[PDB]
Amino acid sequence: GCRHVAIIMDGNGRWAKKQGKIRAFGHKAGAKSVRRAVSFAANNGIEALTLYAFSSENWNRPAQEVSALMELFVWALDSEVKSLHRHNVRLRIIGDTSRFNSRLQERIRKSEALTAGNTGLTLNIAANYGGRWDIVQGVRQLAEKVQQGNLQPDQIDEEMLNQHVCMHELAPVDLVIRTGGEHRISNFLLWQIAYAELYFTDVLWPDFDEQDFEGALNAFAN
Amino acid sequence: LPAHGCRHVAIIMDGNGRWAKKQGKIRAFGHKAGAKSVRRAVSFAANNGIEALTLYAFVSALMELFVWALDSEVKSLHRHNVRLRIIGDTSRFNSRLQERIRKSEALTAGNTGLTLNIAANYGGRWDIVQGVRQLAEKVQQGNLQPDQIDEEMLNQHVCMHELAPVDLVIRTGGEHRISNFLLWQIAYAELYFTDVLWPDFDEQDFEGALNAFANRE
Ligand SMILES: Cc1ccc(Oc2cccc(NC(=O)c3cc([N+](=O)[O-])ccc3C(=O)O)c2)cc1C
Numbered sequence A: 001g002c003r004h005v006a007i008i009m010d011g012n013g014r015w016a017k018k019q020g021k022i023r024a025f026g027h028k029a030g031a032k033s034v035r036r037a038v039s040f041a042a043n044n045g046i047e048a049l050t051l052y053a054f055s056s057e058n059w060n061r062p063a064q065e066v067s068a069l070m071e072l073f074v075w076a077l078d079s080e081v082k083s084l085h086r087h088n089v090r091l092r093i094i095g096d097t098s099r100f101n102s103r104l105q106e107r108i109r110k111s112e113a114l115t116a117g118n119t120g121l122t123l124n125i126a127a128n129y130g131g132r133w134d135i136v137q138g139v140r141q142l143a144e145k146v147q148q149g150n151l152q153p154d155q156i157d158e159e160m161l162n163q164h165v166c167m168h169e170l171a172p173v174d175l176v177i178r179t180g181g182e183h184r185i186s187n188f189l190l191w192q193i194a195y196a197e198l199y200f201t202d203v204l205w206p207d208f209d210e211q212d213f214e215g216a217l218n219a220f221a222n
Numbered sequence B: 001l002p003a004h005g006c007r008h009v010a011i012i013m014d015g016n017g018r019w020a021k022k023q024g025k026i027r028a029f030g031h032k033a034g035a036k037s038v039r040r041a042v043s044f045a046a047n048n049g050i051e052a053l054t055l056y057a058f059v060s061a062l063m064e065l066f067v068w069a070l071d072s073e074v075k076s077l078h079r080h081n082v083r084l085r086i087i088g089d090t091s092r093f094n095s096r097l098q099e100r101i102r103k104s105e106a107l108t109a110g111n112t113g114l115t116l117n118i119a120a121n122y123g124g125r126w127d128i129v130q131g132v133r134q135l136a137e138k139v140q141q142g143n144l145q146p147d148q149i150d151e152e153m154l155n156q157h158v159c160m161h162e163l164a165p166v167d168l169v170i171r172t173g174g175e176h177r178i179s180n181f182l183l184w185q186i187a188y189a190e191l192y193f194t195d196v197l198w199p200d201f202d203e204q205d206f207e208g209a210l211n212a213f214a215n216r217e
């Protein structure tokens, strides 16, 4: 029954600190664990996987370093997309991408467009996504319609707003996993998690493996 | 601020029916035991410096209980200096039915102790949509530009925006879901799940959840 899993991937920083290593070491192992989770979901017929990695710690850096990290994100996408495409994965980015420069925005769009026809796992990667932002994005759309005289306030209902928030084309989120020990959603999905199972594990993201993913799926089944 | 650090606790009070079934009792017995656990939790929050306590379990049988009890329960809240509010779509209740909820709110509205919000016919998606409808009405009036709508603005139109943010959500009964209780308001809340059934959740269990919050925050 588990069709759409969303994961808050916390623990790369603490993992690297436990290893006596710099944060970048944690993030390289974090990216290995991303690849492993995507492969496990695609090999087990999960229809959609939505991954959230954001921590303000990682981004509270001088502007030079922030632009640098943005380039590394798109490099990471560019360096994986041919593999994802060969495995029939549809890649989507959710979030506010208006902060990327034109060149990186076009690179993100190109990877989405390459894989958009694919019919296997849909992999949604959050980049500057917040659950309150996602709702507000939809609200501004409906507000524009009201202003244009094409929609009456009375006509706005849950199904309408749902069609304007991220991921409304996909199966509803069944299961949210958060690694790393904290027991909070931290303004990841909100509208979309109204009926999802919430599974919290103390395992740090770089250590979360196929066995840990199957235990999450068992909590759902139970 | 109390040592536990929690200003506003919200509780999904599940487990009343299972508690009655385990004992070979019919559901009404679980509801009566669940109501005693609600009074006990209200009293504990009032006594432990919590500013606001928001309770969900809200059906037909509990609605019949709601209408009955209401008067006697409000008199006891009033005597404990509790300010009562009902959140949710109360338009569904008949006009005599709405008047009584209204008189209870009015009676306690000057109370300076705990604010107790009882979520009745409430859903987290409904709460967001009613706030959206308020913004849409202001847009239609030409009072509000779509590009002025931001998170802070929508926050000021959802239930309980004038109380402290929800710090802690407790769900009893063993399930690990929010079940369309508060959604927008729990974006940053600590979530605490316990297998204890609601009629058995007592002051020590509430103290446990507060101290877990204090230590994890
Ligand atoms: C190549 C690459 C490698 C790592 C990248 O970045 C990741 C990837 C997976 C997981 C994480 N995860 C965290 O950095 C992380 C997330 C949360 N969180 O989402 O609430 C909290 C803490 C941390 C933390 O480890 O300090 C961060 C991002 C890229 C593009």
Ligand SMILES: Cc1ccc(Oc2cccc(NC(=O)c3cc([N+](=O)[O-])ccc3C(=O)O)c2)cc1C
Pocket: A030, A031, A034, A035, A051, A052, A053, A054, A055, A069, A070, A071, A073, A074, A076, A077, A080, A095, A125, A126, A127, A128, A129
């Ligand atoms: C192969 C691979 C490896 C590591 C990956 O690591 C992730 C996974 C999920 C989300 C993110 N996402 C960001 O790293 C991310 C990047 C930018 N950015 O570059 O301006 C901004 C925000 C975020 C953000 O919200 O986390 C990064 C993602 C992939 C697809």
Ligand SMILES: Cc1ccc(Oc2cccc(NC(=O)c3cc([N+](=O)[O-])ccc3C(=O)O)c2)cc1C
Pocket: B013, B014, B015, B016, B017, B018, B030, B031, B032, B033, B034, B035, B038, B055, B056, B057, B058, B059, B062, B063, B065, B066, B118, B198
């Ligand atoms: C006004 C008010 C205030 C607090 C109230 O607090 C209670 C008291 C007794 C029982 C319940 N609540 C349930 O018994 C209850 C309701 C539903 N429900 O809506 O599906 C589901 C499960 C239970 C369950 O605990 O099994 C909730 C009930 C009411 C009517």
Ligand SMILES: Cc1ccc(Oc2cccc(NC(=O)c3cc([N+](=O)[O-])ccc3C(=O)O)c2)cc1C
Pocket: B031, B032, B033, B034, B035, B036, B038, B039, B042, B062, B065, B066, B069, B070, B073, B074, B077
């Ligand atoms: C603050 C507040 C507001 C409304 C509330 O509304 C309910 C909800 C569920 C149950 C009850 N009330 C009983 O279930 C109940 C029934 C019988 N009975 O029918 O034999 C006797 C005593 C009680 C009793 O002590 O509560 C009352 C309960 C509370 C605690």
